[PDB]
């Protein structure tokens, strides 16, 4: 149920009854990285670890 | 017949264990008249014990039906059936169905009736004088 529109929105491939006569459905078609290489690498020390 | 055999056919014929009032009081009272002391000791108990069961099984089950309420006042035989697409065929029973009587009582329907018949012919020869 989106905040912008006033209707009910549901996930793509479920196994439930159709909710109402007006409603929406969102599916994930694909995704991918956008640039060929990285921007940065963030290094961080684990909290309370030890490598021996 | 000093003792009307009661509540014992449930032990003799294990299949009948549903109801006991309809058997002892309603039916056994209708059979213990046919037995006579002119019989043999080995027959007076088993013969009535068999005839009561024949009378019971004539109806659906000890009282008028089994646990499902699917009983037929006419004992229509089932000749064939098919369940890949439900179908049944029955017999025709109006006066006498097939090699059966139309003016007497047919004792040769079930096995219990045949047992009663085989004892009856043994102990009761038929001849009169009057």
């Amino acid at each position: 149920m989106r905040r912008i529109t006033g209707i009910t929105v549901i996930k793509d491939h479920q196994s439930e009854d159709r909710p109402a006569l007006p409603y929406g459905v969102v599916e994930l078609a694909n995704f991918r990285d956008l640039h060929q290489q990285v921007r940065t690498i963030h290094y961080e020390d684990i909290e309370d670890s030890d490598n021996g | 017949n000093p003792i009307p055999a009661a509540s014992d056919l449930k032990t003799r014929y294990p299949e009948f264990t549903g109801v006991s009032d309809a058997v002892v009081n309603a039916i056994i009272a209708e059979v213990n008249g046919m037995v006579d002391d002119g019989w043999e000791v080995s027959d007076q108990k088993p013969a009535v014990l068999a005839l009561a069961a024949h009378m019971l099984s004539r109806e659906g089950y000890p009282g008028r039906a089994t646990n499902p309420n699917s009983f037929d006042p006419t004992n229509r035989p089932i000749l064939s059936r098919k369940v890949g697409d439900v179908s049944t065929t029955f017999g025709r029973t109006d006066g006498g169905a097939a090699e059966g009587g139309a003016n007497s009582y047919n004792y040769s329907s079930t096995v219990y009736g045949q047992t009663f018949l085989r004892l009856l012919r043994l102990n009761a020869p038929a001849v009169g004088l009057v």
């Binding site: 009910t8 996930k11 439930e16 009854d17 | 006419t74 059936r81 369940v83 439900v86 179908s87 049944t88």
Partner: protein
Amino acid sequence: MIDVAIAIDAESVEVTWRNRSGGSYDSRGNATGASWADTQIRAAIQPVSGRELQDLPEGVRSKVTLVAWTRSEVAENDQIIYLGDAYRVYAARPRPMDGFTRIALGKVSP
């Protein structure tokens, strides 16, 4: 004097009917399926094109289908547990003049 379903009683077996009532959706859009009710019941199952093998690249799996002819009332989306596995109902052909239906069952476990 009418009795047709008396034919379904010749061959039958105890399968667990599993009647279903729908749910609703979480405010985040997900789904919640609930409200099952179980009951032992008698059916007459026959293997109309059952257990077709499938040797996919992912491996091996079977494709099982069945027909029911049961006396009770079963909707189009219920479950029937038979032989230790669950089956989902494809399609029913109810005959309310009599008491029985006809159902297509497909095995659920992949």
